[PDB]
Every structure is written in C-alpha cells, then in structure tokens.
Curated annotation (Swiss-Prot), chain A:
The gene is rpsE. It comes from Staphylococcus aureus (strain NCTC 8325 / PS 47). It comes from the Bacteria. This is Small ribosomal subunit protein uS5. InterPro entries: Ribosomal_Su5_D2-typ_SF, Ribosomal_uS5, Ribosomal_uS5_bac-type, Ribosomal_uS5_C, Ribosomal_uS5_N, Ribosomal_uS5_N_CS, Ribsml_uS5_D2-typ_fold_subgr. The N-terminal domain interacts with the head of the 30S subunit; the C-terminal domain interacts with the body and contacts protein S4. The interaction surface between S4 and S5 is involved in control of translational fidelity. With S4 and S12 plays an important role in translational accuracy. Keywords: Ribonucleoprotein, Ribosomal protein, RNA-binding, rRNA-binding. Belongs to the universal ribosomal protein uS5 family.
Swiss-Prot record, chain B:
One of its GO terms (molecular function) is structural constituent of ribosome. SUPFAM superfamilies: Ribosomal protein S8. Part of the 30S ribosomal subunit. Contacts proteins S5 and S12. Gene3D superfamilies: 3.30.1370.30, 3.30.1490.10. One of the primary rRNA binding proteins, it binds directly to 16S rRNA central domain where it helps coordinate assembly of the platform of the 30S subunit. This is Small ribosomal subunit protein uS8. It comes from Staphylococcus aureus (strain NCTC 8325 / PS 47). Keywords: Ribonucleoprotein, Ribosomal protein, RNA-binding, rRNA-binding. InterPro entries: Ribosomal_uS8, Ribosomal_uS8_CS, Ribosomal_uS8_sf. Belongs to the universal ribosomal protein uS8 family. The gene is rpsH. The lineage of its organism: Bacteria, Bacillati, Bacillota, Bacilli, Bacillales.
UniProtKB/Swiss-Prot annotation, chain C:
Keywords: Ribonucleoprotein, Ribosomal protein. This is Small ribosomal subunit protein uS2. GO terms for molecular function: structural constituent of ribosome. Belongs to the universal ribosomal protein uS2 family. CDD domains: RPS2 (cd01425). GO terms for cellular component: cytosolic small ribosomal subunit. The gene is rpsB. It comes from Staphylococcus aureus (strain NCTC 8325 / PS 47). InterPro entries: Ribosomal_uS2, Ribosomal_uS2_bac/mit/plastid, Ribosomal_uS2_CS, Ribosomal_uS2_flav_dom_sf. Gene3D superfamilies: Glucose-6-phosphate isomerase like protein, domain 1, Helix hairpin bin. The keyword Ribosomal protein applies.
Curated annotation (Swiss-Prot), chain D:
Belongs to the universal ribosomal protein uS4 family. InterPro entries: Ribosomal_uS4 (IPR022801), Ribosomal_uS4_bac-type (IPR005709), Ribosomal_uS4_CS (IPR018079), Ribosomal_uS4_N (IPR001912), S4_RNA-bd (IPR002942), S4_RNA-bd_sf (IPR036986). This is Small ribosomal subunit protein uS4. One of the primary rRNA binding proteins, it binds directly to 16S rRNA where it nucleates assembly of the body of the 30S subunit. With S5 and S12 plays an important role in translational accuracy. The gene is rpsD. Transmembrane segments: none annotated.
Length: 165, 131, 224, 197
RNA sequence: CGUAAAGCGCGCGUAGGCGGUUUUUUAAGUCUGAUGUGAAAGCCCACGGCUCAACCGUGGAGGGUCAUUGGAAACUGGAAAA
C-alpha cells in the first residue's frame, strides 16, 4: 500500500487537475483527475493521485491512496538538516536550509508539500521540468534519501558532539 | 594509460557499494593509504589490510554496512582534478553537507580532513569530498 | 527442526539458469547439476523454525500455498494438520492486498450454501440451479476450503517463489514475515527467511511441511 | 492618501475588528456580488490579504512599508518579529497602545496636531520610531480638552513594556516588546514570503 | 551529442593540453605570517547630529590577477637517482 494510518491529524491539499480524454469512435470519453499530498505537518507526508469521471470521487480516491505511502522526513529545528538536489525523470530540484524567519520560498506545488510537512524556513528553486508531478516525486525522492545526525553517527563507530551540523 | 588514480579508487569504490560485496583490490600509492586511514577514522570503512608483491599494491579494503544493509555514504566525488587543479585557503574552505561529510585535503604538513585544516588555519590543495 | 541425515535427503535443484546471488549456498556443482550446501541449512532451519514458532506463541496466523503441483497433497494435509488456513491453487488478483473483496468472497460462501437447507435444488427451474451448483463447486475449488481468514495475515509460508513471485510481492507491499522453500534458481533476497533446500522432491517438501506444521502446532498449543 | 477612507468595509472583507471605526453586516462581503459565493483563494491572496491586514492597521502605504521591512533586513535575530515590533514601536502605536485613544487614527490626528511631546518636544509626524529611555507627554497646555481625558480615564489596557501615569498623562517606554506582549497577533511567515515574488 | 538541432568518412603526425611508481632535492605554482600600497567620496556595519527619515559627518570593517620579505613540503612543477 504501504501502511496507511488514519490516526494522526490530516490536511489534504490539492495541486492540480486535468481533463483527460480517451477517444472511442463517436464521442470523447474524458476523466477529470487530480494529485494530492497529505501530511500531519508534524513529521509525515506523502502524495496520492487518482482519476475519475468527477472531481470529488477523484480527490477522495487519491486521498485513500495518499495515506498509503509515506516518508518519515527527518526534520530538525523546524528545518531540514541540510541541502540536496532531488532528481526523478528530469524534474530535478534543489533545496537549501535557511536562516530562520524566512518562510518557505518556492513554487506552487512544492510549497504545498513542505508547508504540509511542517517545515518553516527553507530555500529552493525548482529545476528542470515545471510539470507538477515529477517535481513532487523529486522532492520526496530527496527526502527519502535524507538523514539527520542521529541517522548517521549511529552507523559510523564514533558519535555526535565531536561532529555536528 | 591512466590519466588519474582518483578515478580508479573512487570508481571501484562506488561500483563496489552499488553491488555490496565486502572486499576489494587495488594497486597502492602513498596518498591512497593515507586517506584510507582517514576513511577508517571517519567510520565509512571497517578495516584495511596492506599487502606487498611486485611492485605496487594491492591495497585491500573491507567495506562496512548497516545491519539493515544501508550504504553508509550516499555520494562521493573528487574535486581537484587534472587540467583544472584547484586550491583553497584555511579560511575559504568548504564545510560540506553542513557538517556531516568531509572534504579530504592535502597540506604542507600532510593529508588530512578539512576540520583540522581550519582549526590549524592551514589550507592547502583539496582532493575530494565524501559524504 | 533438522538433522544432517535429514539433509542427506535433500538433493539438487533445476539446472537451466541460476541466480549469481546464491553461489554462497552452493557446496559444489557436480554430475551436471547444482546442489545447495547443508551445514548452513541446519542453522537456517533452526532460526526459522524458531521464528514461526514465536509467531505462533503470540496467537499467530499463517498461510500455505500449494499452487505448485507435486506439493498440494501435502499442503492442505499438513496445513489442516496444523489447523491453519490454506490454499493449493489459483491465486486470483489479490488475497493479501485486496482485503476489501475477501469479505464478499467468504461471505458469498456462507451465503449460498445454507439455502441448500430451505429448498434450493430442483425447486427453482433448470436455469438457475445449474448456475449456482457450478458457482459453488468452482468457488470452493479454485479458492480452496479457506473461509477463516478474518483478521488478515501477519506471516506467510509458501511452496515456491518463482511461481508465486507475484503473491510474495503482494506481501512485500505488506512488509511481512515471509518464509519458505528456496530452489537455488529463485530470488533469494526477496525473502528474509530462506530455507535453502530443494522443492521438487516429494520427501523434501513433505518433511518441511511436516516439521513446520509441527512448529506451528507446538506454538499454537503453546499458550497462545 | 494616508487616510480618507471608510476603513470599515476593509475589515468587513478581511475578518478582523479594526480599523475602523467601532463594532451584523460583517458576515457578508462588500459589493453588489458581495453577499454570495465568490472566487477561491490562491496562495497569493493569503500573503497579500495578510499584508493589507497589517497595512490598514497603521493606515500607511507600501513604499514606506517596504522601507521599514528592509531596515529590518539589517539586524540579527529573526526577521518578521523585528518587523512587527518595529512596526508597533511607532508613535501612533505607543500612543494608542498606551490607551490615549479608542482607535489608531485618533492618535494620528492627535500627533499631526503636535499635541504630544516626544521627550517634551513638538513633533508632527506619526512616522517617528519611538525608543526606550524616553518619556512621552501631551503639551501640558492642552492636557484637559474634551477628547483626551475623556479617553485617558478608562483603563482600556496596559502592556508591561509600557508604564503610564494617568494623573500625569506621562507614558515612558520600557522593554523591547514582542507579539506575545502586543495584542492583535498575526502570522509573519506568510507576509515575508510576499516580498519574494 | 543512439533516435529530439548536434561525433568530421577514416587515417599518419606537428604545435599545444594531459600524464604510471619509489626516493632525494629545489621552491616557481600553492599555503601561511609580516611591511608597504590599493586616494577621498561612495557600497555595507556601529555611532551622533538635521524634530524623524532622506541627508551630512565620524569610525569601522571591506576590497588587488599587487610589489617586497621570513617560514612549511603532502600535491602540480623543475633537476637527479632507481
């Protein structure tokens, strides 16, 4: 799925909609769609999508698949640990942490994302493609390949506070 | 003909991480063993064991992995490479990945991590990031 | 459990093509065919036997696939012996990741059958009775006699990966304990709990279904 | 055009009390099409609506508002806080937030007048930046007209970073405030994002 | 830079660019320290005055592929030996 939990708080939030067609002889059968992200803005977020003949159906189905895929998102000081670049299918992306008091600076979709994972001050510029989907998949690809000081110094035989960001 | 040894070492290393078998072989050199000791001091390595025969090498390494088998680095590369050599001061140096990884560097007094190079206020010729 | 003279029984696998992941299991290839080594196998049997036994300590629930032939007679048999639900044939789309339907499925069973009491067969005309009888028989058939999974599984046992690779991946979405027999020509790291021994042989599979039926049964008559 | 507007219709749009003036019809929104359903909100509308929701507070304008914002761009600690406190460490605020009025504009016509005396000195501009280690007074000539002591008498409120002497009409600024010391609290992040694009 | 614009038809070879290992040395490159200079005004930071601001001043830091000079030798470089 993997492991939707409906137990935390939630804030569904919508990114787009298309009107998408399948032509069969005679008419043009088309099916509105939408992407969604869902998080607690307290340490959990993930996307979800679906298609239907109508919006409420689509968005709801999207949300039922939305909770089913998640990332833990190691956050620190209301901020991400460090800077990366995400990449997936030419929808590259670049983040960087910040002096606080800034507020998230980025584009529409990615703003809706990180605003829903409870991150406060961070800097970015989207890159490569402007398509809404693989943008996000870039984001969560990077956040899935991301670490905090406890995630690491465990591995290395030494320990934090001779080393820290 | 090998234009560069850094490529040999770091590429056999990455190619060995993507496949996850522990041990690995390579012809030796002065700098290679120096930095390999640093990586052992990082924690990115378990162990090394030198061995000798006609004439160089083989600097044999045994790599390290979690119990859940996550690769301990994510990434790697040099910087100071042929054609465009590069340098940096003691003040100017980078703090990679705001503090997690490292940036190997050579000094007038030896090859070291970047941290000892800013504490000492001695810069030098950078070699490689790793993180 | 295991003893090495029970591992003098297990022999060989198929020799068409073989995962290079699994040379570590090999003792050495001879007579034109690959074998697995056995000294490790006993350790792994101990560890896994112990694991599934622990899953039965907590009041566990477990599945048996027999969709592979030359196994099924031992699958419902050793499963019904242990007293856990089973399958020995068709794994239709979803039974571990399509939960929302299985309710309707076994509920279809409990629905149609009882009406054989209040007057069903040859009280309604030729056209329906002939339909429902066949629906019932094929239902039980390509399902099996399972009607009992009411809380969805928390561990699985299986006859063979490379046939049921689909179903075990449907477990992989459910990040569960998987365990089962390992022909040397199957995805090794697709399961956390290998049992590196042959699958084709009747005595091998009977022995493994037998002992694992025993470990389960112990853990279930273990205070659950 | 610092202030010549109704200034109620604005607070009818945004969903805040003031300003102004006073406190039915507020569940609606302005205009012919007003009462009905309307557009949704973009992200832009939120940070923007926040901006105006701080702008018509002090009645000021944008070119002054920005210049404030980026003189907060110099100093250390967080940013939006410094913009708030420096925006409410002004002369109109230290007047009305001391309780010498019923609204924010009463202070403005009080000080263009020159009635108050920053450190015992005539000043005609509400755009002064008030500081600690000061007094503030009322041109003792005029501490008895209809408006003032009509307003002085009631204890509207007092923050602990302001002192006050109702007998003397003497305030004096005390500590660096924060929003947790300043009512009419906000979000800062949304408005700082607005001056990105 | 397979197919979307984009690898010459292919070769011989000059000039140039890049260069295996160990040891010893040199100090041009490099790093570091200092002396001078890098006008003033301006930019940025701190302060004070024009009622505040603009503005003005003060003082700070800042800036060179810069010259001179004392130190370090792992790396590039030159010389020598294997």
């Amino acid at each position: 799925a993997r492991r939707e939990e409906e137990t935390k708080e939630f804030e569904e939030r919508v990114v787009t909609i298309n009107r998408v067609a399948k032509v069969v002889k005679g008419g043009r059968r088309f099916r509105f769609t939408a992407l969604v992200v869902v998080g607690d803005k307290n340490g959990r977020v993930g996307f979800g999508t679906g298609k239907a003949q109508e919006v409420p159906e689509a968005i709801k189905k999207a949300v039922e698949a939305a909770k089913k895929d998640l990332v833990v998102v190691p956050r620190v000081e209301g901020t991400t640990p460090h800077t990366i670049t995400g990449r997936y299918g030419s929808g590259s992306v670049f983040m960087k942490p910040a002096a606080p008091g800034t507020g998230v600076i980025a584009g529409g979709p990615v703003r809706a994302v990180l605003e829903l994972a409870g991150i406060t001050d961070i800097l970015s510029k989207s890159l490569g493609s402007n398509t809404p989907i693989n943008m996000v998949r870039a984001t969560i690809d990077g956040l899935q390949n991301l670490k905090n000081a406890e995630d690491v110094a465990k591995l290395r035989g030494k320990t934090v506070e001779e080393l820290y960001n | 003909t090998m234009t560069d040894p850094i490529a040999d070492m770091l590429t056999r290393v990455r190619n060995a991480n993507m496949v996850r078998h522990e041990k690995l072989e390579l012809p030796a050199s002065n700098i290679k063993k120096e930095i390999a000791e640093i990586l052992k001091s990082e924690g990115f390595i378990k162990n090394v064991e030198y061995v000798e025969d006609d004439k160089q090498g083989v600097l044999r390494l045994f790599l390290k992995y979690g119990q859940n088998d996550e690769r301990v680095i994510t990434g790697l590369k040099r910087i100071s490479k042929p054609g465009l050599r590069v340098y940096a001061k003691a003040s100017e140096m980078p703090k990679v990945l705001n503090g997690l990884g490292i940036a190997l560097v050579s000094t007038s007094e030896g090859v070291i991590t970047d941290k000892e190079a800013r504490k000492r206020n001695v810069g030098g010729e950078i070699i490689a990031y790793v993180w | 459990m295991k003893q090495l003279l029970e591992a003098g029984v297990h022999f060989g696998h198929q020799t068409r093509r073989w995962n290079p992941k699994m040379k570590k299991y090999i003792f050495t290839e001879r007579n034109g065919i690959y074998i697995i080594d056995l000294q490790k196998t006993v350790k792994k049997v101990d560890e896994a036997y112990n694991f599934l036994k622990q899953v039965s300590e907590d009041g566990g629930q477990v599945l048996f696939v027999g969709t592979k032939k030359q196994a099924q007679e031992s699958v419902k048999s050793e499963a019904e012996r242990a007293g856990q639900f089973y399958i020995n044939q068709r794994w239709l789309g979803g039974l571990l990741t399509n939960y929302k339907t299985i309710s309707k499925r076994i509920k279809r069973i409990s629905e149609i059958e009882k009406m054989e009491e209040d007057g069903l067969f040859e009280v309604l005309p030729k056209k329906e009775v002939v339909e429902l009888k066949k629906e019932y028989d094929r239902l039980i058939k390509f399902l099996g006699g399972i009607r009992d999974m009411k809380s969805m599984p928390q561990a699985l046992f299986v006859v063979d990966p490379r046939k049921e690779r689909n179903a075990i991946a449907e477990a992989r979405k459910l990040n569960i304990p998987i365990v089962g027999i390992v022909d040397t020509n199957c995805d090794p790291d697709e399961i956390d709990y290998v049992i590196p021994a042959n699958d084709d042989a009747i005595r091998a599979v009977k022995l493994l279904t037998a002992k694992m039926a025993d470990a389960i049964l112990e853990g279930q008559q273990g205070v659950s | 055009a610092r202030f010549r507007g109704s200034n109620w219709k604005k607070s009818r749009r945004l969903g805040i009390s003031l300003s102004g003036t006073g406190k039915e019809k507020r569940p609606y929104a302005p205009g012919q099409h007003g009462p009905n359903q309307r557009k949704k909100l973009s992200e832009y509308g939120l940070q923007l609506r926040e901006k105006q929701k701080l702008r018509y507070l002090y009645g000021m304008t944008e070119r002054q508002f920005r210049n404030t914002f980026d003189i907060a761009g110099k100093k250390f600690g967080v940013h939006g806080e410094n913009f708030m406190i420096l925006l409410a460490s002004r002369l109109d605020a230290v007047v009305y937030s001391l309780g010498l009025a019923r609204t924010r504009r009463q202070a403005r016509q009080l000080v263009n007048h020159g009635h108050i005396l920053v450190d015992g000195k005539r000043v005609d501009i509400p755009s002064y930046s008030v500081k600690p280690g000061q007094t503030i007074s009322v041109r003792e000539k005029s501490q008895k007209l209809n408006i003032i002591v009509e307003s002085v008498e009631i204890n509207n409120f007092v923050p602990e970073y302001l002192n006050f002497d109702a007998d003397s009409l003497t305030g004096t600024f005390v500590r660096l405030p924060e929003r947790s010391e300043l009512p009419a609290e906000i979000n800062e992040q949304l408005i700082v994002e607005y001056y990105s694009r």
